[PDB]
Write a protein that binds this DNA or RNA. Structure first.
Ligand code: ZZV
Ligand code: ZZV
Ligand code: MG
Ligand code: MG
Ligand code: MG
Ligand code: MG
Ligand code: MG
Ligand code: MG
Ligand code: NH4
Ligand code: NH4
Ligand code: ZN
Ligand code: ZN
Lengths: 184, 368, 368, 184
DNA sequence: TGCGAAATTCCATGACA
DNA sequence: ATTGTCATGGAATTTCGCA
DNA sequence: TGCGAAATTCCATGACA
DNA sequence: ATTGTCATGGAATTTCGCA
């Protein structure tokens, strides 16, 4: 069996609804399985249509052999299947109610949700503009298991934006109080 | 003047009037019998006015001015006085073409790493497609990997929107552009400062300086044209295909595609290369680093037989950028303050500001 | 196809499949272990589709197409099949640039006599001066003697008015022009027929063919510019001065002014030449005839190292004249009917008409 | 003394009033003394102004050393003198009532008047358009005294419009009757 | 240890507003 | 304060397959 | 029968929409 | 059925002035 590579498998999933930001409501999350690299795309709906439009952007940069998802409606539609067939991409579904990725991906998806939650509170409506800085953060975050960031594994170089301050990622006492106020 | 010509008439030797010719008087005028015929020797004090009158008939250069003068006159070293006037005729200096070529082009080193340097430019206006008229083109210096963004204008705002999306992937050390309005605005300067990105500008009116992206523009247009043959020019929906198509095209001289230089491995595209299937990613990134350093790099071509190279303190003239009908193609003479490299200089205009300028937009002032 | 690959698998020799390599089966596919790795040998009947798929990714040329194919496949003489497809891709043929230069320029013989051949052209639009916007420029081939006429339009009517005045002096055998609207109208053709004047046209979109007058345009504009420095561009009142100034300017290579070539003696202008003062007119016209025949004539320059020359029956393509945005720069292939000279040909378009065309507006179709 | 040359002397004079032609009324006549070459310029008046404007055309082709004329008002004006001085042209006047040229010029001026008269009758108003063909005729007319036409003496070549039919130049019986009818 | 032919490399040409 | 580039397809040169 | 300097010729460069 | 041209000013080459 051959070693694991970038573009071998992309793991996709939606996050949201979120509070509106420039008319956007969801984030399509794409994680490269081998490297842990994250691409985020803001959408208005978890539809096949928004998924196709967003993946068209990413797949005009690099095409995965396999896309892995849960059995979200957007991903099990025959339109999405057509889309993937057209591009020679194999689709792969986790069984209903039993989501499985890899340790690396799971932990990454975790960081994504926590980091999102953190920076939204205070400014729950300004997340669209922050998506770039979020991805840089995620992709320049050191992997305990491998000696390298996703940036490094993807491009084979150090980055020009290293994130040396490995951040708290936890909500400070104020933010817990603020987050429970916005939910009122 | 009159004293010199006097001593001459009474048969004495004056320096530069060859002794073997007979100098006489006739009609109140000093004359001499030269092989071509009898010419008037005017007094020195008259010579500048003669040269100037001859020159002004059609603002002729060295020989064509001399040939008029020689029709009537002779005196020592006529061309010396002709050249003196040519060097002082403001009109000839700013209207005439240069007849000296630039020194050979530099081949700057390829950026060492992906993301070290971006070259960006606009193409357009193109025929309207979904309301769009332009394309922002971003080319990574090291890899040639290219990103395309359709815009409605070559504006800072659209540049910033596009680059916020791109720099989601990585932030480049330097962005090199030409002096298009979108890149030179203070808004764009701020945008770059906010991100620790250094902005680097081509010398003005010198698209070769953006050669990396310009050359990619060519391929972009060439591919779009081929895909549009016998169809309406609906190019918007093709930008993505073109991006992917070119990023995965081999450079015959490099033997690598820009994608391979960026990632060290093909993605799921047609005819993907499989040579590193058995390598670990780490072994693969190892081979990539080696491949990146050993790429062919061109050398400075031979100089043409009549090139000039700039020297500090030299008088040179900047080409007028958009010269009006029937107006000079050159600015007034100015001075080389600093030679930044053999093809780039700083000049003081004469007003005057410091300008950093390409040698291609300069001629060396004639006649010193 | 399948038969050939069969005999191959059972260890027999098929021509062009080198014997020293082992050809096996794996996953329903014929394979072979080559120095670079294991490649699939597809059946002959599959090869054209492969080459085409590779080529179509970015419509790449020989090597960049081959490099994609070689990633997965091997078979005998792959480039032969690549080149075959390139020669059939209509899109590549009409979009790509040529990489072969034209053969060296001809230096046609100087017209033997004044009035043998006029070259005429328009300059403009210029800035409005007394209501005028253009200049008709008429240059006598032999002498370079030039006449200037201000016009309001580059029209046949203004051409005819101007030439009625000029041909009061003499009637020329031939008038050579470019294909400007004013010269190609049937009104102008009639005007010439009425006078026994032969009209001679440049090949289309090839201003070098009117080089004689074009080059005079340069001097005309250069002098006007110099005289207009620091003044409003009121050029109308200067045409006469410029005419006279240039007709009396020396050509350093000839040592004669156009006036001298036309008349054999200077008129009352500044610095008039006096060498024939003692000759009879007849002796003077005698020396003129001698001077006219002995003028320097340039020779055809050396060919560039990769020029092409047209051959009867060759496939060549005419450059599109005013190509629209994102459209091919070349017409479909057409055939050389006749080689009029090494730089001028007649082609059948494919519709098709006979066109007489400059080699500079042609490329030789690639890949035959 | 040096031999006679083209541009040594131009002889100028006006012919008219004539019947209007495209608004024109006179012909300024210029004859090169050495060659007998003729330039004709249609004018609206025998004024200094029309003379200057017409000679500006000719003198942008070739400049005479000497212009010879009678004491016409247009030629004795100080404006015309200024004009000539500017151009280094010497002015020369025949004494009043005693016009003198050369044999060649006299005969030429004669031919001009006779040829004009001839072609005007029948079409007395269409002479403006005929001035070119008139000058070609005159300048390609063989000189009995010299073996050459003015064209040949000026340019030193044969012309492309030779006038082999040395014409009658006299008025036919019809034209004498027609000319005496137009004068009614 | 050398031949004919295929493969690879060379590189002038031209186009990026 | 900055700097030309590189796909292209014939030709020239090297390598391959075989002996 | 040769030297230094002036004169002449050579010719690449660029521009004619 | 038509076809590049030639002013320009440094450099290269020839000629001049003198011996
Ligand atoms: C009209 N100019 C401009 C050009 C281009 C720009 O992108 C410009 N952007 C902004 C402003 C002016 C621009 C450009 O792509 N060019 C084509 C090109 C490319 C490479 C070459 F070697 C030659 C020509 C010319 S310019 C630099 O003044 O001449
Ligand atoms: C725009 N073109 C035209 C040109 C000229 C004309 O007079 C034209 N008249 C009519 C129609 C089109 C004309 C002209 O003077 N040119 C300048 C020039 C001169 C010499 C060169 F070597 C290069 C360029 C281009 S063209 C021939 O299509 O390219
Ligand atoms: Mg989901
Ligand atoms: Mg630009
Ligand atoms: Mg550009
Ligand atoms: Mg024209
Ligand atoms: Mg022209
Ligand atoms: Mg009179
Ligand atoms: N460099
Ligand atoms: N010829
Ligand atoms: Zn001048
Ligand atoms: Zn193609």
């Amino acid at each position: 069996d051959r070693p694991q590579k970038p573009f071998d498998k992309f793991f996709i999933d939606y996050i949201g609804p979120l509070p509106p930001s420039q008319g956007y409501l969801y984030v399509l999350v794409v994680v490269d399985g081998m490297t842990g690299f994250t691409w985020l795309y803001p959408t208005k709906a978890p539809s096949t249509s928004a998924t196709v439009k967003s993946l068209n952007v990413l797949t005009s940069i690099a095409i995965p052999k396999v896309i892995h998802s849960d059995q979200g409606a957007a991903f099990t539609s025959s339109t999405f299947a057509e889309w993937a067939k057209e591009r020679g991409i194999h689709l792969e579904f986790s069984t209903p109610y039993h989501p499985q990725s890899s340790g690396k991906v799971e932990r990454k998806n975790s960081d994504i949700k926590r980091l999102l939650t953190k920076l939204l509170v205070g400014r729950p409506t300004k997340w669209y503009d922050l998506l770039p800085v979020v991805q840089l953060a995620l992709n320049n975050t050191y992997s305990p298991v491998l000696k390298y960031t996703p940036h490094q594994l993807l491009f084979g170089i150090d980055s020009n934006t290293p994130f040396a301050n490995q951040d708290t990622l936890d909500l400070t006492r104020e933010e817990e109080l603020s987050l429970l106020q916005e939910i009122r | 003047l009159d004293a010199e010509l006097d001593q001459l008439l009474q048969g004495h030797y004056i320096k530069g009037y060859p002794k073997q010719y007979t100098y006489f008087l006739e009609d109140g005028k000093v004359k001499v019998s030269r092989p071509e015929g009898v010419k008037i020797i005017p007094p020195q004090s008259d010579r500048q006015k003669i040269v100037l009158q001859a020159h002004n008939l059609a603002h002729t250069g060295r020989e064509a001015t001399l040939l008029k003068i020689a029709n009537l006159y002779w005196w020592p070293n006529m061309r010396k006085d002709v050249v003196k006037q040519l060097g002082r005729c403001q009109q000839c200096l700013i209207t005439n073409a240069s007849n000296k070529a630039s020194g050979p082009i530099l081949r700057p080193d390829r950026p060492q790493k992906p993301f070290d340097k971006f070259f960006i430019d606009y193409i357009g206006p193109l025929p309207p497609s979904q309301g769009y008229l332009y394309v922002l083109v971003v080319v990574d210096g090291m890899t040639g990997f290219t990103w395309l963004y359709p815009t409605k204008a070559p504006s800072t705002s659209a540049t910033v929107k596009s680059l916020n999306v791109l720099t989601s992937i990585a932030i480049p050390k330097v962005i090199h552009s030409d002096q298009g309005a979108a890149f030179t605005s203070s808004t764009f300067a701020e945008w770059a400062k906010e991100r620790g990105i250094h902005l680097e500008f081509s010398t003005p009116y010198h698209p070769q300086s953006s050669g990396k992206v310009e050359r990619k523009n060519s391929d972009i247009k060439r591919l779009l044209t081929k895909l549009l043959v016998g169809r309406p020019t609906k190019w918007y929906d093709l930008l993505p295909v073109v991006q992917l198509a070119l990023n995965n095209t081999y450079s015959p001289v490099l033997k690598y595609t820009p994608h391979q230089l960026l990632f060290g491995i093909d993605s799921n595209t047609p005819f993907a290369n499989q040579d590193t299937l058995d390598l670990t990613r780490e072994e693969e990134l190892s081979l990539l680093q080696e491949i990146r350093t050993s790429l062919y790099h061109p050398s400075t071509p031979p100089a043409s037989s009549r090139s000039w190279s700039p020297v500090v303190g030299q008088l040179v003239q900047e080409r007028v950028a958009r010269p009006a009908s029937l107006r000079p193609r050159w600015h007034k003479p100015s001075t080389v303050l600093k030679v930044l490299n053999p093809r780039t200089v700083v000049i003081l205009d004469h007003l005057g500001n410091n300008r950093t300028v390409s040698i291609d937009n300069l001629k060396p002032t004639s006649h010193q």
